[PDB]
UniProtKB/Swiss-Prot annotation, chains A, B:
Pfam families, A to Z: Amidohydro_1
UniProt cofactor note: Binds 1 zinc ion per subunit.
PANTHER family found in the cross-reference section: GUANINE DEAMINASE (PTHR11271:SF6)
Residues binding substrate, per UniProt: H77, A78, S79, Q80, H231, I232, S233, E234, D321
E.C. designation(s): 3.5.4.3
InterPro entries for this protein: Amidohydro-rel (IPR006680), Guanine_deaminase (IPR014311), Metal-dep_hydrolase_composite (IPR011059), Metal_Hydrolase (IPR032466), Metallo-dep_hydrolases (IPR051607)
Cofactor names: Zn(2+)
Signal peptide coordinates: none
NCBIfam families: guan_deamin
Classification lineage: Eukaryota, Metazoa, Chordata, Craniata, Vertebrata
This protein's GO CC annotations: cytosol
The protein's name: Guanine deaminase
């Protein structure tokens, strides 16, 4: 017995088609949350037989509505949500000392953690982020709370307790090398002990990690076969800082790679100043990049050249990087990635820029690949889990104005782009993770 | 007999202070719609005597609300709103051929015009744009319809019938030189004849303007003492195309200057490729620039160096440039202007970037000056018109989540920025133009 059968239009990406619009198709969802069939509505009779459903069980979408896959945020600091949107007109250092560290440090209080984490999980779900790869804080128990919160709301997630044994600017926010190693093993073990269906722990070296701790986190990830998340070559100062602290290493990428932290389950945020040779290394190891356009521009870090990454066959997703990037919305990330690629065209760095459709793919299929999840989610193939968002361009109080020509013909050039460019949570009517409807909230 | 007395927080700009926050102040508005007084709420007793009102005529704003000035869009094509947000992933000339020109051409149909024009005026108003400087089409009667629509809704505006006697790229959309002059004289005349309180005609040379039409449009502006608006130095190809079509002249700027189209009532959009010598002329003439950041990026045009424009003491505001820029929101224009300044910092063109507060000044007081309306609007100086927007960060379904700390102390570094970076029409509770409440709509 299928949990759902939907009739209408479906918009997703494949590896040979940035955006595929499937009009008047039927889509079935098994009791276990999987995509069971997807075919033109003409095949209704044959399917009603093959799958033993009656026509009255079909939910007919409005011709104005369309489904698309859940958005995949490959990099976001859940613990930075409370001041996201505040002044960034401040040297990075002061930003860290005034906002970031005091905020994250406050997560020793379980009630502050509960407040913020509940809020950021709700907020990102209602904006269509079905999968989120979160940075939390150095606090094991609070980070465990985040995981518990994402599972309660039904969001797919990686949750990473942060690790740092270096912090000159805010000495109170950090661990001893030994405390960090121990608390990471505890965090991972207590996560796993929970038997969560769609939340997993991830090894998360923070900004300020000694070489001994680096090697030890490497070891943890290796012996437990864990995902890894970190920041890499975000800005010129951070690049110089790592050359000084690790002078024996040829580059930032080598610091991670030689310490067991650059693996085929590794995602690395930013990458603005990676070299071509470093991208080759990423390819070989099967490590991914999380493109964080808003943050890179908002904090004047630099420009990730997404075309070069693509040329090098490096896995790549989009991220939000709350709060470095001020917006919690992957729609904003799509818009900003498009613009960053435009910037490199104007500057004659590249010969072309990325299409909205290409960035739509990165925000969904691309992100899921970067997280090693493209076998389960990312587009509407058969067997994958139903992670999807129902878009109504014409919803109550829509920020979109629609005119004759928006709803017929090549809609992939009209209403669909009007949503990506101008839509917001008002257009996101329903959200599904693993076939279960998670928005509207219960 | 005062029209409104408001008690609460006021946020605006002055020429000495990018953002001034006036907490728990009192503001009076006359029946003529002028700001009669603005003072600390302790002065309530004196002011009530001074201005003969009882204290129950005072409206107390919520503690989570503040007024700021209306936003001033110094450049927008109302006639392009119907396709705003559709594909821009094609060469510029194809975009013009496929989208821009067919859409404007359609404005021969007065119902289509009414439809589109009604929608954009309503949309911009509900997003806090209290003053808009519109491009319409070459059609005189339809442009007059726009003016009448702004007047109906209460939006302060300039309306420009477009003038082009040249169009190789889309020949169905153009005028004869002679027709363009006569129909411009008629547009100006028929609009003035309306006796509009708040809308004025603006001489609008389009892209596709002969030298003969150029000098004649100048004459019309000079003898009629009219405002002028055009595009200048938007992209590298346009700069070059101008070298060819006008080999006589030194540059893009002289072309206009020598034809009486560079005056102390002139606004010029984009200016991405204006030299320093050209900015000096702008200064001497008192000509303004409309910075259109979303457009410059969306169309991969270039970057306006706003820091250099200001150094040359050229008047400058922000524009949305629908549909070149896909967003109708001046909030988006603020966000994009900040990011363009960051790009120049990142590339080391500039040693610093603009602050949100500086860009907020541009969006209001700066834009009002570019339009020559800074004596009547733009901030909360006594005697100005009450063009204002009531902001509620905690509105129903608010895109912003607030946390303890957001609404006290230096809020100019907190909620105010959160609204500016993350807010939308849901937070804009009421809009006032000339002291008249124009939003919510009757
Ligand atoms: Zn980050
Ligand atoms: Zn324009």
């Amino acid at each position: 017995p299928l949990a759902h059968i939907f009739r209408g239009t479906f918009v997703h990406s494949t590896w040979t088609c940035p955006m595929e619009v499937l009009r008047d198709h039927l889509l079935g969802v098994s009791d276990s949350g999987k995509i069971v069939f997807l075919e033109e509505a003409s095949q209704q009779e044959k399917l009603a037989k093959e799958w033993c459903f009656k026509p009255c069980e079909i939910r007919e979408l409005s011709h104005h509505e369309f489904f698309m896959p859940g958005l995949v945020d490959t990099h976001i600091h859940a613990s930075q949500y409370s001041f996201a949107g505040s002044s960034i007109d401040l040297p990075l250092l002061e930003w860290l000392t005034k906002y970031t560290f005091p905020a994250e440090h406050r997560f020793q209080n379980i009630d502050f953690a509960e407040e913020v984490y509940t809020r950021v999980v709700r907020r990102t779900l209602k904006n269509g982020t079905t999968t989120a790869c979160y940075f939390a804080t150095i606090h094991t128990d609070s980070s465990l709370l985040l995981a518990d919160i994402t599972d309660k709301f039904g969001q797919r997630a990686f949750v990473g307790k942060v690790c740092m044994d270096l912090n000159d600017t805010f000495p109170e926010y950090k661990e001893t090398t030994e405390e960090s190693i121990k608390e990471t093993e505890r965090f991972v073990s207590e996560m796993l002990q929970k038997n969560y269906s769609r939340v997993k722990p991830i090894v998360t070296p923070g900004n300020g990690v000694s070489e001994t701790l680096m090697g030890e986190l490497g070891n943890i990830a290796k012996t437990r076969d864990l995902h890894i998340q970190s920041h890499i070559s975000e800005n010129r100062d951070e690049v110089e800082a790592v050359k000084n602290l690790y002078p024996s290493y040829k580059n930032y990428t080598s610091v991670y790679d030689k310490n067991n932290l650059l693996t085929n389950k590794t995602v690395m945020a930013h990458g603005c100043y990676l070299s071509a040779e470093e991208l080759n290394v990423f390819h070989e190891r099967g490590a991914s990049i999380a493109h964080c356009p808003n943050s890179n521009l908002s904090l004047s870090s630099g420009f990730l050249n997404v075309l070069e990454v693509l040329k090098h066959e490096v896995k790549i997703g989009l991220g939000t990087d709350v709060a470095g990037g001020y917006s919690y919305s992957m729609l904003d990330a799509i818009r900003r990635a498009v613009m960053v690629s435009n910037i490199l065209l104007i500057n004659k760095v590249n010969e072309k820029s990325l299409t909205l459709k290409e960035v739509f793919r990165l925000a969904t299929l691309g992100g899921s690949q970067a997280l090693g999840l493209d076998g389960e989610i990312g587009n509407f193939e058969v067997g994958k889990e139903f992670d999807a968002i129902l878009i109504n361009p014409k919803a109550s109080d829509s920020p979109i104005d629609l005119f004759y020509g928006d709803f017929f013909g090549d809609i992939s050039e009209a209403v669909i782009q009007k949503f990506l460019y101008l839509g917001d949570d008002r257009n996101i009517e329903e959200v599904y993770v693993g076939g279960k409807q998670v928005v509207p909230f219960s």
